[PDB]
Design a protein around this ligand. Sequence first.
Ligand SMILES: [Zn+2]
Ligand SMILES: [Zn+2]
Length: 88
Amino acid sequence: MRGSHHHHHHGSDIIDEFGTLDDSATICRVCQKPGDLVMCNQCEFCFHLDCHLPALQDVPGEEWSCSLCHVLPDLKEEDVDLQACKLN
Ligand SMILES: [Zn+2]
Ligand SMILES: [Zn+2]
């Protein structure tokens, strides 16, 4: 790419694309999709630290940090082939 037309600058590395998670895949479904969109790593929501409500400015890193999605799974089945315990 280069060789000696810049003589390096502040640091020496540039850092390649980092994240390999957001910036693609799922969509916000509330304001934007193909660009800037932090997802909820606790369930399956898709928003940004600025399209929640007048109160989403806590940026921990990467995306937001999920919110109050409240997705209590009442019909989820995980290898329920044999009823060992006793809960229909
Ligand atoms: Zn959004
Ligand atoms: Zn969530």
